[PDB]
Amino acid sequence: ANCERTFIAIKPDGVQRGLVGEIIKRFEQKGFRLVGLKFMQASEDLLKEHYVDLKDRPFFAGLVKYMHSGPVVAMVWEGLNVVKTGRVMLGETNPADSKPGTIRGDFCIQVGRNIIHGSDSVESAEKEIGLWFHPEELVDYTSCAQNWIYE
Amino acid sequence: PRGSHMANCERTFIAIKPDGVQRGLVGEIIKRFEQKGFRLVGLKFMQASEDLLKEHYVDLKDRPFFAGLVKYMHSGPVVAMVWEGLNVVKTGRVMLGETNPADSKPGTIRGDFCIQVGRNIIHGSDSVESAEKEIGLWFHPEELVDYTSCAQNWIYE
Amino acid sequence: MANCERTFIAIKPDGVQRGLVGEIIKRFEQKGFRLVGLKFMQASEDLLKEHYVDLKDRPFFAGLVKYMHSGPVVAMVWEGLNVVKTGRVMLGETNPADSKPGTIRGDFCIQVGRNIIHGSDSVESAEKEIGLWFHPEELVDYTSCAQNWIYE
Ligand SMILES: Nc1ncnc2c1ncn2[C@@H]1O[C@H](COP(=O)(O)OP(=O)(O)O)[C@@H](OP(=O)(O)O)[C@H]1O
Ligand SMILES: Nc1ncnc2c1ncn2[C@@H]1O[C@H](COP(=O)(O)OP(=O)(O)O)[C@@H](OP(=O)(O)O)[C@H]1O
Ligand SMILES: Nc1ncnc2c1ncn2[C@@H]1O[C@H](COP(=O)(O)OP(=O)(O)O)[C@@H](OP(=O)(O)O)[C@H]1O
């Protein structure tokens, strides 16, 4: 419910093109609560486990190499239906189909340079959060606006 | 008729709810209507009485959320507004996004700024008939200001 | 290559009058499209009649030409993968009544006849429009510093 969490990663192209603050602002202004935030170079072992559902796809090795080629911003956000709603805010996975107003619709063009990843399901979010963050890196606090965001 | 000056003079009632005020979204919301080309006619900051809210939401008096909605709308100040323009009722609703924020698209006010249906930041008239009733209920005629936008000939044919 | 497709975008006199030039350009730059041509001009009625030749028999044609000649326009050429189709998506529906929030027309204008901008509808129309509005020498070629982060 209101405490659902999702994993969002800003990809190396999102960092290189100076979109970190823009992306974070979209989640903050929506009313989602920041739980975790890290900046790192993800190892190929970590990326292969993150993208384990894609291990049989032809683009898998290139996606892992690319995701390891620069730093990423790993994040955890909390809120009601944050997994599904986070995916709507990102826009379609393929930027060609993403609508203006979405992060990919506004800021990127091609699927291998799509700036961001968001968990596709509550099950995938729980696995991704556990893989990228130690439990002690996730911060719990109450937003001063909680009563104005949720009944 | 299409292209008539009178069609450009349609008005709608928009209220920024207590959560929109609390979360500092008043300026953001007003900027969206101004940049679109809609003309501001009325604007006031007020605490709406429960009697005014019960009449505003009279069609919902039998819904289970009615009492909570009236209490919530009375719990803080609201920004009441009247905007004018071609199809401003329907287009204002499109700009707000779906009533339930879960279904509102990015780019819309609710799509960008809020999450749950009971805390949806804003109300807009659902039809020209509801707009006429709502404008009359929230504003005295002397609070509605008429003027001509300097960009009128660049917004309308 | 497919990443070198080009489209023609014109900001109409109402877009210039209402101070939307920078906002429109920012939308194309932030998307990752490359600016190729940019010129500010009063389009002649002869140029506009050729640009809108397919509408010469429509009842609104004379008013459209007069309107497009009534003030300056910003003529532009942008480059990128599927920039024609994607540029149209970014502009929003031709009729602003049907354009969604988040698009240029959805955010900034209301009526057809004052719809702030034009974008090529097809690669064939883009080639014709670019040739009509720009001399080849006005089109600038350079490589974006972010090319490898926009395209694989
Ligand atoms: N050709 C490709 N090159 C690189 N990554 C790709 C390619 N096709 C798909 N993907 C990635 O493969 C993942 C799955 O995308 P799909 O389109 O197959 O499914 P999805 O729309 O349900 O996410 C996406 O990763 P992301 O969530 O980190 O964006 C997508 O970007
Ligand atoms: N659970 C709820 N709690 C509070 N208000 C609600 C709830 N469900 C619906 N409403 C409100 O009830 C009003 C009518 O919304 P509906 O979606 O029911 O519309 P409808 O009656 O045509 O279906 C909306 O008010 P607004 O225009 O000021 O936003 C909507 O927000
Ligand atoms: N009543 C009208 N007055 C002025 N221009 C019009 C009118 N109806 C259509 N047009 C213009 O006629 C052109 C063709 O619009 P259509 O709706 O017929 O087709 P489109 O949606 O497939 O592009 C558009 O020009 P633009 O690309 O420069 O915007 C459109 O604006």
Residue numbers in the entry:
A (entry chain C): 2 to 152
B (entry chain B): -4 to 152
C (entry chain A): 1 to 152
How did the manuscript describe this experimental structure?
NME1 is also known as nucleoside diphosphate kinase A (NDPK-A and NM23-H1). NME1 is a moonlighting protein with multiple catalytic functions: (1) the NDPK activity, which involves the transfer of a γ-phosphoryl group from a nucleoside triphosphate (NTP) to a nucleoside diphosphate (NDP) through the transient phosphorylation of histidine 118 (H118). Human NME1 shares more than 85% sequence homology with NME2 (also known as NDPK-B and NM23-H2) and is reported to function as a hexamer.
Using X-ray crystallography, we solved the CoA bound structure of hNME1 (hNME1-CoA) to a resolution of 1.7 Å and in a space group of I212121. By applying crystallographic symmetries, we obtained the canonical hexameric structure of hNME1-CoA. The 3′-phosphorylated ADP moiety of CoA is observed in all three monomers, but the electron density surrounding the pantetheine tail is absent. This is likely to be due to the high flexibility of the pantetheine tail, which is solvent exposed. A hydrophobic patch composed of L55, Y52 (aromatic ring), F60, L64 and V112 stabilizes the adenine and ribose rings of CoA. The hydroxyl group of the ribose ring interacts with K12 through H-bonding, and the 3′-phosphate group interacts with K12, Y52 (hydroxyl group), N115, H118 and via H2O molecules to R88, R105 (side chain) and G119 (main chain). The β-phosphate of CoA is observed to be more solvent exposed and oriented away from the catalytic pocket and H118, while its 3′-phosphate is located near the catalytic H118, where the ATP γ-phosphate would be.
